[PDB]
From a paper:
VZV belongs to the Alphaherpesvirinae subfamily of Herpesviridae, a group of enveloped double-stranded DNA (dsDNA) viruses. The highly organized dsDNA genome is enclosed in an icosahedral capsid shell comprised by multiple viral proteins, which protects the viral genome from being exposed to the extracellular environment or detected by immune sensors in the cytosol. In the replication process, the viral capsid plays a central role in maintaining viral genome integrity and enabling virion assembly in a highly regulated manner. Similar to other herpesvirus capsids, the VZV capsid is composed mainly of four types of protein that are arranged in icosahedral symmetry with a triangulation (T) number of 16, including the major capsid protein (MCP), the small capsid protein (SCP), and the Tri1 and Tri2 proteins that make up the heterotriplex.
In this work, we present the 3.7-Å-resolution structure of the VZV A-capsid determined by cryogenic electron microscopy (cryo-EM) single-particle reconstruction. To counteract the effects of local defocus variation and conformational heterogeneity within the large capsid particle, localized reconstruction of the sub-particles was carried out to resolve better details within an asymmetric unit (ASU). This strategy improved the resolution of the ASU block to 3.7 Å, in which most regions of the capsid floor reached a local resolution of 3.5 Å and the apical regions of the capsomer spikes revealed a relatively lower resolution of 4.0–4.5 Å. Each ASU contains 16 MCPs, 15 SCPs, and 5 heterotriplexes (Ta–Te). The MCPs assemble into either pentamers (pentons) at the 5-fold vertex or hexamers (hexons) in each facet of the icosahedron. On top of each hexon, six SCPs form a cap to cover the upper crown and to bridge adjacent MCP protomers for securing the hexameric structure. By contrast, SCPs are not present in the penton capsomer of the VZV capsid. Additionally, the N-lasso is well resolved in hexon MCPs, whereas it is disordered in the pentons, resulting in loss of the lasso interactions between the pentons and adjacent P-hexons. The heterotriplex consists of one Tri1 and two Tri2 subunits that are assembled into a triangular-shaped structure. The embracing arms adopt different conformations in the two protomers, which are further crosslinked by an interchain disulfide bond.
Author numbering:
A (entry chain h): 4 to 228, 267 to 316
B (entry chain P): 1061 to 1394
C (entry chain P): 50 to 97
D (entry chain P): 146 to 344, 377 to 482
E (entry chain J): 19 to 49
F (entry chain R): 531 to 578
G (entry chain i): 118 to 372, 382 to 483
H (entry chain g): 4 to 160, 176 to 316
Write the structure that this text describes.
């Protein structure tokens, strides 16, 4: 079995040590696999590109190229972890639920950058870095979650762009799972992540789609009863293909619970099988 | 067309030279602990790959300094002292022009008459890397950063170890409090530190939000997407620091051969590749100074007609010739 | 191959052959840390 | 590494006895032995690369350490003395860059610099039973590690050799926790060495005498770092910045003069050296003339920034 | 944090240190 | 006139004429000839 | 080498007593999510609460009807494949095998409140495919049943998750090995329709054919066994289902001048709208006409209203030249034709590929 | 661990056996998976469609239908190879780089026919066949090649810059049966990306052009695009209709979701899919053409 | 290569078919009948 | 139940032999004995 | 590469009037004198 050891730093405050003890079964994502690694690869510092902190669209691309791992146990002077990579037969693999939705048996696990609310994370002020943990949501809910968040942002731009808003609506959006509703983003104020991390995500989505039902309407005018005209096609194919690989859905784990509670709430830990 | 507007420039360049060092150490300088080896059976590509591993620990038993190092000799130069301008068209984020043909023609004209330029298709969602040329001639080219200034500027200031910012700064002028590195970097209500008779040299690249300072500061992130290196970055970044000991100890500890900030494979001096670990000694960076090399506004006054040494006139009629005052005086054949 | 000689032609007496004239190799001596003059820069010890 | 057919031949466990594979098994065992004998010595060799490279991040520059060590009235100084010392530091660093290259002809400045470098650092603890010594009995003090080129340049006529062989310990001096030390590290979590409080080999190695001390001189490049794929340290790099004005025009009538009468005469009626310049000229890496005109600044001034 | 062991901790010293100089002038190397 | 002529910009200096950005550089081969581009399969003079 | 999954549930849809060891068992999501998805995805014009009417009567004819809403963990989690096969037996092509399995599952079960339960489930699925709430996201997959223990109306079952079929030990039957058993109604191999050689490795899929018309909808369940590739199965299924695809494309949605963009952009002398007026000072007289286009497209077949199938990989068979055997044996008190699959390795993530063409 | 044994034909010349020993870590394809196979399946003669050598568009369809296999240690008589597609654990798998482009850590591998210069391939005169090995590039380079090939196909009925180096493609379209098939699957994806919600997104063009300026980032989005830049200043876009049942429905939800699944299917149906991920332990970060790397099954 | 600020020094003897190149390349065989040696020959031959 | 670390401490197969882990191996096999002596008696008590 | 020998467009600026070494001025008015940079520097008497 392949395992990665993260070296705990010296002269760490006891409060930061106790909080590290809490995040036992959480997911770490490693750039390059090696038996010995440093905290710089775990901190958010290794994640940001072009100097600025990373973006949601950038984080989605980070999770694909970068390899994931799972913490197993912490030690007052050492930190261990196991990989979900090539062939490792990890025994007793358990994870902690980080998403607000509940999980059940036979549910596959995917990953997602934090979108709903402010991401919780451990912050080490002494060393000067923080470690952000990814969100773990089921598969069936993942494709719906993304479509609802982006559609929410376009509604805000429309209400600002249009001279008058078209406010008349159904109420508040909500995601239901196992007879439990989530009622996300009740208030219109508190635009915390409206355009803070999903800004560029909406832009690229607002251009490829606009090119979608426009190119067809400009190529076959029979649908509704100087100019390249080909480089636009090649550019549209190259973009829409890359964007699709970005917003992919690939399960990473399966929740296989034996002699235990079927349904599990945010904060509990369950044994999972490597898919 | 050659019409000279009302502005002058200062060019800043950075070079690196491979040197030979000499190290001395005391007798009992460190305590070394070695553990026991471990074996790791592991499958391989065709067979098996055993891995041996051994831990060790090191502690310096010094009540002071027990080791010294000195750069003794000089080997061949690595980079080249060419004339390669820096293209500011490798970045994105600034407020553009209202008309797109304007900026297209601007970029085309800037690319014309240069060496490094972004690729023409201008790939969206990319790095905007320059085109890879053919074989290299005599070493890695080094970029040059331009800073604007008034025309009638003191020429005697460029004859010694000056500072490109126009005003002396650094954490080497302290003694009472901590809120003084910020005081002497932009506050123009008091005289300069070095030349205690004026605020700055050029009032266009030394204020809090002057043109040069807005161009590159590190905290503004104007050239985040640019893959090329910028040598004038360290003279503008404020370089925060805390107070734990006296200035002498802080100075003695800062000089420790910090990591590099370039690449030794490409020919354009790109940014430091993430993951490459090579240590280089960086003088004149902890002092915030630069040495002026042998330059001259005119070429005729550069060499005398005696088949030998070079001329050293200062000013002929309106031109000038700056005598070399760099550490590299008895090298670099002519 | 069907080789047919009329009567006592050539290429019946030429004895061509290759020959190997020997082989060589290196020695690859070793080196210990204590025989080096650098060992007077630190006090090493073992610690299981 | 070990190969698949090799491990298969080895894992037979007496299921053979023919005459062909009796040679293949021997050759596989020989290959394994040849590989292991070098893998073992790899650690003995890499010990000396871990050292000599743990010390380059501890050693500060001599040009800075020497005047700081000269000026020690009270350790802590006032602002006036600190500024006076920083000026001298700047002056020393600007000049004393390359000794062996600039003062290559003069061979006594080099000995002076070596003596100053030697008498610059501070000694450490001295507890020991046996240590490195010469044939007579004098103890050694320090080490001078360098390149073979500088070693030869120093040994030709600068330094003088004192001895060619020396005595060196051959023991590691292990230590382990036992007795009451094991019981206190499990119920409390602490330990102390000792816990008893009641209250040689002739080895060829060059030795020189610099200053008044006897130091080792090493130039290891054939014993270590030879025929490997790793680079030799002490071949580091130094970065240097250069600054040059381009189009400055001295706006004054007393400085736009000439030092002689017919300095640079010209047949034209208007001397083309009173107009303000536009470019700058200097030398290349190989002594070629280069030019930096105003047109080359068209990439930073014609931007939307 | 340090200070878990007694700072004086009067016991049999391992070895004597030399170069008695002003140590307060540089205390950044210490922990 | 779809584009601009290439024979009317004679204000360039030797540096600009030599630099690789010069489009008319590839046609400067012989000092006694002028290499230009012309519509093919026509006779001079021709139609209006 | 294999792993197991346990879960307790109500026995109104699954009876581990009569079901043979090695049959397929599926699970269901919480029914409360159906309404939250229906009221937001229902096609415009259609009534969104017909599903609620069809759903309430299902639990009204089921034991413990006062236990819906909280989801404490004591609901009808799992179900059997033969259950859905009997619920929709009137749609499979094998008439006699369908109705035989139907009567068998009616008799072997309580047979008192079983027929009513079946018809409720039938229109339940019918109303499921009425507002685009397609039942391929609410029906998961478990492995073949391995062991069970029941005391009354509540059972604890354990099944294999992934791996070889005969690598477990049921340890209470005659032998310690079991093989996959399926009703002959759902089995449908496509290669013998597509006329290609059947040699080597073959994958297993589950398909959900959908028919969308006015007051007439249908949903079958087929266990396809084909050698076709992972994604090429989609192109293969369309050739056989070309009829229903075209039927749906015309009866799926039951509830304007072009513009010459390239023409007027290739030619000049068209009304231009330079950025100088879109800066945003008087952006109405600048865009007064610039065109009209009188354009809108509201009622058109979406890619979701023309869907007719949804498949998913379940497992493979490494042994070449498979020899699946079909025979009739007693199931409770009646005989049903079952097909026996041997040596099938389970695996594959639960991802559904929808064939909308 | 599943492996397939390719029986090499007898009476092989010694020169060809050495050349076959050069192909240690390349990739081969099979029509039907089986433990024992013959050399005719791997030969290009098996790729024939009607009676002739295949086409680059026909090869893209043969790659999806056929199974994938990886060559391993070859002995004089037999030719060992392991399977890829079916889920099967393989410890220590490795591939030889065949593309002119370099690879690094964490790159997904695709599979496309030789579009560059004449494919380097082993030729057997005595047996009478030849085997062509497929070409392996990363995902990013894959999507760009397909885009230009499809565009050239519509033209009938090229330069690619990677790492500052330009390349060319000699696409072959001597057939017509496969060319029109790619047109069908293309327009069927565009036709299924049109719902009632385009109108809203098509009405946000003016505010997009306004946001284009004083942003310095949307301009690059605008320059690459052509349609929205032209329609932005040429069409009026009548203001807005109403919703049939707006009291409980969200119309822009489908369109933003209906497109997600469509785009993901686009990259696979048009060309091939990702087959492998490269992740080498204790090796170089960048591999050069001709060298081998340790890769992980996807 | 040498001077990375210009294409060539003279554009009349450095192109593919310039005057100086056409005069002597070694692959065009213009002075084959000439018995006199040409020193500039070695500088214009591609020299595989 | 048996913890993961206590399981690895026994599956070592003589890859150890230092001092401090010999005690960890002792307290590992003692927890199994203390636990097994209870589960066996649990069946004995469970009959009643 | 090729080495340029001691040449000059004029013959007057070639030799100085001092009974000895030769002149090495660069340009007088419009002529030129290239200083020798060939390996044959201490040979070929003048």
């Amino acid at each position: 079995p392949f395992e990665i050891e993260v070296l705990l730093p010296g002269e760490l405050s006891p409060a930061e040590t106790s909080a590290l003890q809490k995040c036992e079964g959480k997911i770490i994502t490693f750039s390059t696999l090696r038996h010995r690694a440093s905290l710089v690869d775990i901190a958010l510092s290794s994640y940001y590109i072009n100097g600025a902190p990373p973006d949601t669209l950038s984080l989605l691309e980070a999770y694909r190229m970068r390899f994931a791992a799972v913490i197993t146990r912490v030690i007052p002077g050492k930190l261990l972890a196991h990989a979900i990579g090539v062939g490792t037969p990890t025994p007793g693999l358990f994870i902690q639920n980080t998403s607000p939705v509940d999980l059940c048996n036979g549910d596959y696990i995917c990953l997602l950058p934090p979108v709903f609310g402010s991401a919780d994370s451990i912050r080490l002020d002494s060393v000067g870095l923080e470690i952000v943990f990814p969100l773990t949501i089921p598969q069936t809910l993942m494709r719906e979650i993304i479509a609802k968040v982006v559609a929410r942002a376009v509604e805000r731009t429309a209400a600002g762009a249009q001279i008058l808003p078209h406010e008349v609506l159904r109420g508040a959006d909500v995601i239901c799972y196992n007879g439990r509703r989530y009622e996300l983003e009740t208030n219109l104020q508190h635009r915390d992540g409206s355009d803070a991390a999903i800004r560029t995500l909406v832009l690229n989505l607002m251009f490829s789609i606009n090119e979608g039902c426009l190119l067809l309407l400009a190529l076959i005018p029979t649908l509704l009863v100087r100019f390249p005209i080909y480089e636009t096609i090649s550019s549209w194919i190259s973009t829409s293909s890359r964007l699709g690989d970005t917003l992919g859905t690939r399960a990473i784990l399966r929740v296989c619970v034996f002699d235990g509670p079927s349904t599990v709430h945010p904060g509990d830990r369950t044994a999972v099988i490597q898919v | 067309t050659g019409f000279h507007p009302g502005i002058a420039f200062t060019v800043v360049r950075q070079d690196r030279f491979a040197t030979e060092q000499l190290l001395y150490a005391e007798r009992a300088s460190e305590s070394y602990f070695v553990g026991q080896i471990q074996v790791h059976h592991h499958d391989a590509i065709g067979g098996v790959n055993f891995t041996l591993t051994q831990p060790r620990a090191h502690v310096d038993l010094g009540v002071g300094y027990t080791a010294v190092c000195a750069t003794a000799a000089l080997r061949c130069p690595l980079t080249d002292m060419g004339n390669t301008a820096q293209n500011l068209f490798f970045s994105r984020g600034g407020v553009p022009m209202l008309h797109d043909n304007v900026t297209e023609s601007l970029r085309r004209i800037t690319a014309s008459g240069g060496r490094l330029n972004p690729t023409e298709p201008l790939p969206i969602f990319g790095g905007l890397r320059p085109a890879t040329s053919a074989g290299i001639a005599r070493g890695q080219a080094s970029v040059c950063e331009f800073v604007a200034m008034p025309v009638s500027t003191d020429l005697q200031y460029f004859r010694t170890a000056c500072n490109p910012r126009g005003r002396a700064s650094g954490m080497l002028y302290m003694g009472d409090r901590d809120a003084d590195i910020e005081a002497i970097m932009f506050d123009h209500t008091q005289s300069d530190v070095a030349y205690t008779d004026r605020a700055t040299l050029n009032p266009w690249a030394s204020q809090k939000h002057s043109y040069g300072d807005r161009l590159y500061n590190g905290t503004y992130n104007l050239t985040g997407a640019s893959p090329i290196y910028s040598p004038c970055f360290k003279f503008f970044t404020p370089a925060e620091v805390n107070t734990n000991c006296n200035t002498l100890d802080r100075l003695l500890m800062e000089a420790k051969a910090v990591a590099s900030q370039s690449s030794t494979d490409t020919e354009y001096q790109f940014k430091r590749p993430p993951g490459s670990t090579e240590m280089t000694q960086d003088p004149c960076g902890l002092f915030q100074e630069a040495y002026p090399p042998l330059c001259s506004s005119d070429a005729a006054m550069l060499r005398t007609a005696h088949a030998g040494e070079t001329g050293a006139d200062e000013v002929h009629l309106a031109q000038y010739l700056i005598r070399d005052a760099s550490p590299l005086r008895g090298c670099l054949p002519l | 191959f069907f080789k047919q000689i009329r009567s006592d032609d050539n290429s019946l007496y030429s004895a061509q052959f290759d020959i190997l004239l020997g082989t060589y190799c290196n020695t690859l001596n070793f080196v210990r840390f204590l025989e080096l003059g650098l060992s007077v820069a630190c006090i090493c010890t073992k610690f299981p | 590494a070990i190969a698949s057919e090799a491990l298969s031949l080895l894992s037979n466990t007496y299921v053979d006895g023919t005459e062909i594979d009796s040679s293949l098994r021997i050759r596989a065992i020989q290959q394994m032995a040849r590989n292991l004998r070098t893998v073992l010595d790899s650690f003995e060799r890499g010990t000396a690369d871990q050292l000599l490279g743990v010390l380059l991040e501890k050693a500060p520059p001599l040009s800075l350490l020497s005047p700081i060590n000269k000026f020690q009235p009270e350790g802590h100084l006032n602002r006036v003395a600190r500024a006076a010392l920083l000026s001298d530091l700047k002056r020393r660093v600007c000049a004393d860059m390359f000794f062996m290259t600039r003062h290559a002809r003069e061979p006594r400045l080099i000995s002076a610099y070596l003596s100053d470098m030697v008498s610059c650092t501070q000694p450490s603890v001295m507890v020991s039973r046996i240590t490195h010594t010469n044939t007579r009995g004098r103890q050694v003090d320090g080490v001078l590690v360098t390149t073979a080129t500088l070693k030869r340049q120093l040994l030709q006529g600068i330094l003088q050799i004192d001895d060619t062989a020396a005595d060196v310990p051959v023991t590691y001096g292990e230590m382990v926790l036992q007795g009451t030390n094991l019981v206190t590290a499990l119920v409390m979590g602490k330990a102390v060495r000792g816990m008893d409080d009641v209250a040689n080999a002739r080895v060829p190695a060059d030795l020189v005498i610099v200053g008044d001390k006897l130091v080792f001189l090493e130039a290891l490049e054939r014993r270590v770092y030879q025929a490997t794929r790793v680079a030799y340290p002490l071949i580091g790099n130094i970065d240097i910045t250069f600054i040059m004005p381009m189009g400055v025009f001295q706006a004054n009538s007393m400085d736009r003069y000439t030092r002689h009468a017919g300095d640079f005469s010209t047949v034209s009626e208007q001397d083309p050296r009173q107009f303000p310049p536009q470019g700058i000229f200097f030398y290349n890496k190989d002594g070629i003339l280069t030019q930096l005109t105003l047109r080359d600044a068209m990439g930073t001034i014609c931007h939307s920034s | 944090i340090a200070g878990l062991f007694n700072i004086p901790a009067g016991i049999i010293p391992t070895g004597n240190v030399l170069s008695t100089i002003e140590v307060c002038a540089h205390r950044c190397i210490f922990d | 006139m779809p584009h601009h002529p290439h024979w009317v910009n004679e204000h360039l200096t030797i540096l600009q004429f030599i630099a690789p950005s010069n489009p008319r550089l590839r046609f400067e081969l012989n000092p006694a000839f002028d290499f230009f581009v012309a519509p093919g399969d026509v006779d001079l003079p021709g139609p209006q | 080498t294999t792993q197991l999954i346990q879960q307790v549930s109500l026995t109104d849809f699954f009876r581990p007593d009569i079901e043979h060891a090695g049959s397929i068992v599926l699970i269901l999501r919480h029914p409360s999510d159906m309404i939250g998805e229906a009221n937001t995805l229902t096609q415009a014009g259609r009534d969104p609460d017909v599903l609620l009417e069809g759903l309430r009567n299902l639990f009204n004819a089921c034991t413990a009807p006062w236990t819906v809403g909280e989801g404490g963990g004591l609901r009808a989690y799992v179900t059997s494949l033969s259950f859905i096969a009997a619920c929709r037996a009137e749609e499979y092509t094998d008439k006699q095998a369908a109705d035989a399995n139907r009567t068998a599952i009616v008799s072997a079960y309580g047979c008192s409140r079983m027929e009513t339960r079946l018809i409720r489930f039938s229109e339940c699925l019918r109303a499921m495919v009425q507002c685009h709430v397609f039942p391929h996201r609410f029906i998961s997959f478990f492995g073949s049943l391995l062991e069970y223990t029941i005391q009354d109306n509540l059972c604890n079952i354990t099944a294999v998750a992934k791996g070889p079929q005969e690598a477990a030990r049921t340890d209470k039957t005659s032998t310690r090995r079991v093989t996959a058993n399926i009703p002959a109604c759902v089995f449908w191999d496509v290669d013998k329709d597509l006329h290609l050689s059947a040699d080597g490795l073959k994958h297993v899929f589950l398909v959900f054919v959908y028919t969308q018309r006015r007051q007439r909808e249908g949903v079958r369940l087929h266990l396809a066994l084909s050698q076709l590739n992972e994604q090429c199965f989609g192109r293969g299924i369309g050739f056989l289902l070309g009829r229903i695809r075209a039927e749906n494309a015309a009866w799926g949605t039951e509830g304007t001048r072009a513009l010459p963009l390239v023409q007027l952009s290739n030619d000049p002398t068209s009304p231009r709208c330079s950025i100088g007026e879109i800066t945003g000072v008087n952006w109405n007289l600048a865009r007064q006409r610039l065109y009209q286009w009188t354009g809108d497209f509201r009622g058109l077949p979406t890619q979701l209203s023309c869907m007719y199938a949804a498949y998913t990989l379940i497992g493979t068979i490494p042994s070449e030249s498979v020899r699946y055997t079909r025979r009739m044996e007693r199931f409770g008190g009646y005989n049903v034709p079952t097909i026996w699959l041997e040596g099938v390795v389970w695996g594959g993530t639960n991802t559904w590929n929808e064939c909308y063409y």
